[PDB]
Write an enzyme that holds these catalytic residues in place. Structure first.
Site, short mmCIF file in Angstrom:
data_model
loop_
_atom_site.label_atom_id
_atom_site.label_comp_id
_atom_site.label_asym_id
_atom_site.label_seq_id
_atom_site.Cartn_x
_atom_site.Cartn_y
_atom_site.Cartn_z
N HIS A 65 0.86 -1.19 0.00
CA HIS A 65 0.00 0.00 0.00
C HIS A 65 0.89 1.24 0.00
CE1 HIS A 65 0.21 -0.48 4.49
NE2 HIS A 65 -0.16 0.79 4.59
N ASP A 73 5.94 2.95 5.34
CA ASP A 73 6.63 1.72 5.66
C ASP A 73 6.59 0.69 4.53
OD1 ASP A 73 3.80 1.50 6.17
OD2 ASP A 73 4.17 0.03 7.75
N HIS A 103 -7.10 -1.84 6.20
CA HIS A 103 -6.17 -0.88 6.77
C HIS A 103 -6.06 0.37 5.89
CE1 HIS A 103 -2.34 0.65 8.36
NE2 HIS A 103 -1.96 0.74 7.10
C1 LIG Z 1 1.47 -0.34 12.92
C2 LIG Z 1 1.03 0.69 12.19
C3 LIG Z 1 -0.42 0.71 11.73
O1 LIG Z 1 -1.14 -0.33 11.77
O2 LIG Z 1 -0.92 1.78 11.28
C4 LIG Z 1 1.90 1.91 11.83
C5 LIG Z 1 2.84 2.30 12.98
C6 LIG Z 1 2.67 1.66 10.54
O3 LIG Z 1 1.71 1.15 9.58
B1 LIG Z 1 1.45 2.17 8.61
O4 LIG Z 1 1.25 1.60 7.04
O5 LIG Z 1 -0.07 2.73 8.82
C7 LIG Z 1 2.52 3.28 8.88
C8 LIG Z 1 2.85 4.47 8.19
C9 LIG Z 1 3.89 5.27 8.63
C10 LIG Z 1 4.59 4.92 9.76
C11 LIG Z 1 4.27 3.75 10.45
C12 LIG Z 1 3.22 2.94 9.98
ZN LIG Z 2 -0.35 1.74 6.42
ZN LIG Z 3 2.39 -0.60 8.69
#
Ligand SMILES: C=C(C(=O)O)[C@@H](C)[C@H]1O[B-](O)(O)c2ccccc21
Ligand SMILES: [Zn+2]
Ligand SMILES: [Zn+2]
Length: 231
Positions: free
Chosen positions: A83, A87, A148
């Site tokens: 996505h 990350d 998500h």
């Molecule tokens: C566990 C997470 C979630 O479940 O949000 C976060 C911490 C992690 O997942 B993510 O794709 O949303 C993201 C973006 C930028 C930084 C960190 C994340």
């Molecule tokens: Zn995310």
């Molecule tokens: Zn994540």
């Protein structure tokens, strides 16, 4: 055993062999004052490697490529980002400069552009409707529906019965929701059901962050998302 967040300094990357030609990669990063681990996948593709997701940022992703060369010694020729969030695409420019063909769905590419995140070069077609699946070398890509995020993909490795859920699947230790600003809470449990229905044979399930388990991770995630919905 599977490396945990407390055992990985930020900047270092660990690989975990699941099966012949199948690994996860594990990195860590600070976010909002806490340290999170993060998973992606590496799948052998003849004499080449397919990468699923970056290692969360340029520095980590450079370490990831160095660790792959050291531990595996095969070239990463393509990468898929599951996505648009940092990350999963943070580090795409590092991959591209190394000659990796970076891919994501048009949905992910548009949203990354909007958000100011790095944008994988190539577009994965055939994944725009919930339930859609496409073969990509040694994996199947699946779009389960909004969860998500609206663009989130999951990845299945049929040779090893490995299902990588990305950030749409939570580890057991996570009993409260992560970031949900971009989520579709109403649809998330339905999307998880589509995963269950499409990959009922999966044996090793990998969340976006934390320890792998089995298909029980899908029920766990449903429990957590529904609890969040209600509070
Ligand atoms: C566990 C997470 C979630 O479940 O949000 C976060 C911490 C992690 O997942 B993510 O794709 O949303 C993201 C973006 C930028 C930084 C960190 C994340
Ligand atoms: Zn995310
Ligand atoms: Zn994540």
């Amino acid at each position: 055993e599977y490396p945990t967040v407390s055992e990985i300094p930020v900047g270092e990357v660990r690989l975990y062999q699941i099966a012949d030609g199948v690994w996860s990669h594990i990195a860590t990063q600070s976010f909002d004052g806490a340290v999170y681990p993060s998973n992606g996948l590496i799948v052998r593709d003849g004499d080449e490697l397919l990468l699923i997701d970056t290692a969360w940022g340029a520095k980590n992703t450079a370490a990831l490529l160095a660790e792959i060369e050291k531990q595996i010694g095969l070239p990463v020729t393509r990468a898929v980002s599951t996505h648009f969030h940092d990350d999963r695409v943070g580090g795409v420019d590092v991959l591209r400069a190394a000659g990796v063909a970076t891919y994501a769905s048009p949905s992910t590419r548009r949203l990354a552009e909007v958000e100011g995140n790095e944008i994988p070069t190539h577009s994965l077609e055939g994944l725009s409707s919930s339930g859609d699946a496409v073969r990509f070398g040694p994996v199947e890509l699946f779009y389960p529906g909004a969860a998500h995020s609206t663009d989130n993909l999951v990845v299945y490795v049929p040779s090893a019965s490995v299902l990588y859920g990305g950030c749409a699947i939570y580890e057991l230790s996570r009993t409260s929701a992560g970031n949900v600003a971009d989520a579709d809470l109403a649809e998330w449990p339905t999307s998880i059901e589509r995963i269950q229905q499409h990959y009922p044979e999966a044996q090793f399930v990998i969340p976006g962050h934390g320890l792998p388990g089995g298909l029980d991770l899908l029920k766990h995630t449903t429990n957590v998302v529904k609890a969040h919905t209600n509070r």
